[PDB]
Every structure is written in C-alpha cells, then in structure tokens.
Design a protein around this ligand. Structure first.
Ligand code: BQM
Length: 182
C-alpha cells in the first residue's frame, strides 16, 4: 500500500540548463500532485557520480518539493546509469534515509543518453523500474532499445521516449489521467 518512489535523474554534460530545469520541474509537478498520499519520495542526481539530493525523511519532514530541490547543482559529466541504479538499490532504499521496509519500491529513471558504464542491475530486481528517455539521442529504434535492460518488463509499459524536454509537460498531463482512488 505504501509506495517509496525514487527519481533517478540525468545530470550529464549533454543537458542544456533549461533541459535540466525541465526535469526538476517535472519531478516537482509529480510530487505536488501526490502530496498527502501513501507516496514518499527521494531524488538522486546521476552523472559520473551519484548524489541523493533529498531522501524520504526529508520529504516526510518538509513536504515541499520546491525547497527540497532548490540546491541541486548540475553535475555536467557522464551517464553512469548501471552504477546509478545500483547506488539507488543499495544506498537509497534504506531505513537510514527514511525508506519503509515493506513499501512497494518504484524507480523513475529520467535520461537524455545511453549509459557510459556497464555491468548489471541484479541488486535492483525488487524495484518496479520506469525509464523516460528524452531528446535527439533517442531518435533510432536501436537507441531506445538500449534503455530496455534498465526498466521492468514489458518495455511497452515501463519505457517512454520523448522527442523533447517540452513533452514532459504533456507526459505530466497524461499521468494525471491515470490517477485514481482505488
Ligand atoms: N508509460 C510510462 C513509461 C515510463 C515512464 C512513465 S512516467 C511515470 C510512470 C509511473 C509512475 C507511477 C507509478 C506508480 O506509482 N505505480 C505503478 C506501479 O505500482 C506502484 C504504483 C509515475 C509517477 F508519476 F507516479 F511517479 C510516472 C511519472 F512520475 F510521472 F514519471 C510512463
């Protein structure tokens, strides 16, 4: 019933300042809409390295997406997606950061490029993983397909590709049509 949800977001060099900002604003739009629910949130920037920008405890105490993300600094480096996802699994989904042990775990990966590292995500198997790939880096079917190994199956359900960063506005509109009292 409880959902612990991590936004794992790309801070690579390829992102223009306004593109990075549109990611930030997308995350806030989502959290604001799901205020006062069974959702609790944390946000991790990844590039070459990984940074938990805020954790579940931070979210619980303040409940203010704007404040929680105010101090994000765009890393401007690589796109170490394998390491990032592994970092979330082992270093973010923990009591110490406010995670609830029995909650349903959800990861929302937002990226504008293919991974710069390699390996596996065995450690993240218990997490429901969604991945949003954005921009001209994902023009080809082959580039979209590379994202599939990161997300839960089927890709048709757990993978979304967006032509541009403006389409995050549109995805948020669509998302809200999937909100129900169950
Ligand atoms: N089709 C597709 C593919 C890739 C990305 C997306 S975007 C997305 C998707 C799902 C969710 C939330 C899911 C959620 O909370 N669930 C469904 C799984 O079971 C637990 C509840 C969410 C969230 F808003 F609730 F967090 C998104 C979001 F965040 F808008 F990106 C959509």
């Amino acid at each position: 019933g409880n959902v612990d949800l991590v936004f794992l977001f790309d801070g690579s060099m390829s992102l223009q300042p306004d593109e990075f900002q549109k990611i930030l604003d997308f995350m806030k739009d989502v959290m604001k809409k799901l205020s006062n629910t069974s959702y609790q949130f944390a946000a991790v920037q990844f590039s070459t390295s990984y940074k938990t920008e805020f954790d579940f405890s931070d979210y619980v105490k303040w409940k203010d997406p704007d404040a929680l993300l105010k101090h994000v600094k765009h890393m401007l480096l690589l796109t170490n997606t394998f390491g990032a996802i592994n970092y979330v699994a082992t270093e973010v989904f923990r009591e110490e950061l406010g995670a609830r042990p029995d909650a349903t775990k959800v990861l929302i990966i937002i990226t504008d490029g293919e991974a710069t590292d390699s390996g596996n995500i065995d450690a993240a198997k218990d997490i429901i993983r969604y991945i949003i790939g954005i921009g001209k880096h994902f023009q080809t079917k082959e580039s979209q397909e590379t994202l599939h190994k990161f997300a839960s199956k089927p890709a048709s359900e757990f993978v979304k590709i967006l032509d541009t960063f403006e389409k995050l506005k549109d995805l948020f509109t669509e998302l809200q049509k999937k909100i129900y009292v169950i």
